[model samples]
Target chain A: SNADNIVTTKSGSISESDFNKKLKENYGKQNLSEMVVEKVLHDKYKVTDEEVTKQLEELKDKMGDNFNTYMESNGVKNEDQLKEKLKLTFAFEKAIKATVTEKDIKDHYKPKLQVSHILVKDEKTAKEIKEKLNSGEDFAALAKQYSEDPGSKEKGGELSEFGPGMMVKEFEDAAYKLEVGQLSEPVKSSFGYHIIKLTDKKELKPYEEEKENIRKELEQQRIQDPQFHQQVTRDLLKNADIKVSDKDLKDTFKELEK
Target chain B: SNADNIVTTKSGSISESDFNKKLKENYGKQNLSEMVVEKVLHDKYKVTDEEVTKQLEELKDKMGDNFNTYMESNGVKNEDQLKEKLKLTFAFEKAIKATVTEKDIKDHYKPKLQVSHILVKDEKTAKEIKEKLNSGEDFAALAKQYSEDPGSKEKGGELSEFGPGMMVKEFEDAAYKLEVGQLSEPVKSSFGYHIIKLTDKKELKPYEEEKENIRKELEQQRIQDPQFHQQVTRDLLKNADIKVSDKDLKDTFKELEK
Candidate 1:
């Protein structure tokens, strides 16, 4: 719509080119290094420096030409408009970078607790079993001997990470609140309880180290980026002068409703 | 950490002393606030204002002399500890508010668009039809007669504002680039041919109207407030001596993994 035709170089891949053009448009030609650093800080949640270098190499290989094509195809018309869009994208990425940190990553590592239990059917039976455990019968042997929870009986009733809310409120409350070595009193829940034990606990990997992989698990969440990209594109459109000549096409305006 | 505890004047609410006692016991009164925030934020996302209020109400309702009993049952020891926890929770809330802003909200207001199309299928036919319309032919009648894309043909082959990548490669490329009301030159792809028109567009709602909602949404992204919250929680938790009693549970698997 205006005469600020910025020269956009076309390369082999549109997606890669688009990404590069977006970066260039936002950061300017002189500040590619800053953009690279910003992206690394924000996205390389964890991994050795070596890993970071390797990943950057891969990214360049994959996106180098595509970035060129992206710049060409988008047809950014004016330098001013391109600069504005570029800055917004850069700021948006910066905001995301600022929001996450190493401590946040460390705190995300949850310890998984392994527990074993024998769920007997009746209170009378539960009482009898509790008495046996209290008298020093090995809980695992007892579980193997008379446990009704068939699933974990063979594995010595090993239950995992019995956090709050893992079982019926009453049962979980009793189990999770018990000290590591302590045995519970005769606890009655909807399912008649027998003996429960905390055999082992293991701290899992921190979320930061795995956040990238975690993000992959969360791909559905990331999928919204494209939607956001479209919305941003429209905002750019609205800020410009757009005209549709056909009046018939105007009444079909409800199509954007889709 | 101090012996000084504030007593609540209300009935049916746990006194500050009770909460303090629980904190001292669970997190060593000095570190009580940290333990609670870390636990909640680590497990759930950062505590929202609504959550903070709800928890306060629940704590108040569970007070009275039963406060200590309640704490013990919940595995909390000091009433002051709960108070400290609530304070830390509030700090987290404050930190998030401090970190996120109107700009952040605006960045988030951008929405995603998904679009699917049934193309007219014949490049020549679609082009001829578009040209005829450009030359003053009735688009709806022409669409009904020749467009193979039945879904929108009766309605004149309309498409709307959509995020990129939500549509097939060729169509998305063409549709996103068209000036509003400007019909394309019969773009071709696997779906055959399309004469796309950018019928209309919508801008995202401004952040001022949606800051609270945007903050909530971005919490999931952890792309906005996690950093500040992490720092605050770590400081609080470190000051509060939260400990895992089981020696085996103390393994920093993340450290090992790294």
Candidate 2:
């Protein structure tokens, strides 16, 4: 037993059996989750060895000379261990990708709006500016004369195209409610009073142009939600039988409700 | 000016100048610190183009295809930016190395001790075992009969050689005080009681064999001490003139005691 002892610290001694038990308890869930993810990816998604190799190559290129040191520091002993870790990373990415679809992207799509506003210090000035625009006074000319918004006043209050939520609640609501060539009455906002005009409303970008952004958005959402990750793990573990001989690991699995 | 506007959010709009000002305020300190670190490395250490290139090549080799992606994610725009970042990293490593010396290593060196122990559940059993050993019973034979430490009991209570702080304080104190061929009376510990015996003592490893480990230990200590890192940064900046054109950045530097 002395020969099998692995560590002796101020806290206490740990034999080989104790060390192995600790390792299993601490890492068992992660190990099992990775295994399940890999299996699902291979069986259902057909994640290929070539893809894994490509990812490995990419990582090696990125890490350069520090690659081995990084791996060793992370307790990854060799290329095999690195590949295993990458396999799980890639599997999770693919799982996230699986959740996004073309329809979902279209459903969430919002077109940009090119808007302009004449901002004034009071509603009286804003109402006067609105009356000028309604009486066929050039809107841009009136904006140049009355708008106090430093950002747009000099250019006759013409703002760059933007999407929803890009303006104050009152401003955004009023702007979106107006059609192209339509103008709004005096609108109160945190930035004081505004006479808003919708110059143009752009269409959503082509699907190819937006697909990568959609994927990124969905991936961010999925990663941020702990419940989503746990559900994914649970779904993968449901059909799998993970066995642990160590009492610590048995307790870990039991606590995980498996 | 509206045409030049860069950001319009629910909070308010930001003109190009304001946008740039905000960017400088938020990122100026980090950017300036990196600049200072780079300048110090280049001016004092003469971190050359060849060294940076070699480091980059090593990174390229290790990172493989992910190199560009990794750099991009970290806001490293190009090879020049990567080189700058690596130069600072190398400079810090060199600074840490400069603090470690042979004298320091020698001062902290500790010799290993080979020990054996007969552990029992209670003080009475421990005292009985101590009496048996005093009455001419073979220590190893008595240990085999009575020691309950599963880690060492099967091997007649012989433990592997260890250094200071590797055992409970009472056990360590007794074991280190005992000379080779000396046996100790019962020592009370969290592990119940230990009847210790000193089998052998080993000297520290040679300086050359242990130099890297010494350097690593010192480096870890230095890095973990936030005050040390801040002091190093402060020292580097003391003889330097760091100017910030942005008011927010100026305030930040002032808060950092310039």
- TM-score per model for chain B alone? 0.35, 0.64
Q: Write the per-residue lDDT of candidate 2 for residues A1-258, one digit (tens) a residue.
A: 523643332323334454334334334444433433455655545556788889889888999998877987654557877776777776766666667778776654667889888888888777777877878998888887878888898887999887644557777778778999999888887878988888888887787788788667876777767777777666554544444433332333343474
- In candidate 1, what are the lDDT values of residues B78-161, reduced to their tens digit? 655565467565655654555556666664464443332335777667766777878986655776677777677767655555
lDDT of 2 by residue, B153-248 (tens): 778789999865457777877887899988998898877888999888987778678768766777777776777677766655554545543333
Every candidate's DockQ is 0.01, 0.01
**TM-score, second chain, candidate 2:** 0.64
* Best candidate (score: TM-score): 2
Candidate 1 contains a number of clashing pairs equal to: 36
Number of the predicted model whose lDDT against the real structure is largest = 2
Clashes of each: 36, 17
TM-score, candidate number 1 = 0.24
**CA lDDT scores, all candidates in order:** 0.51, 0.68
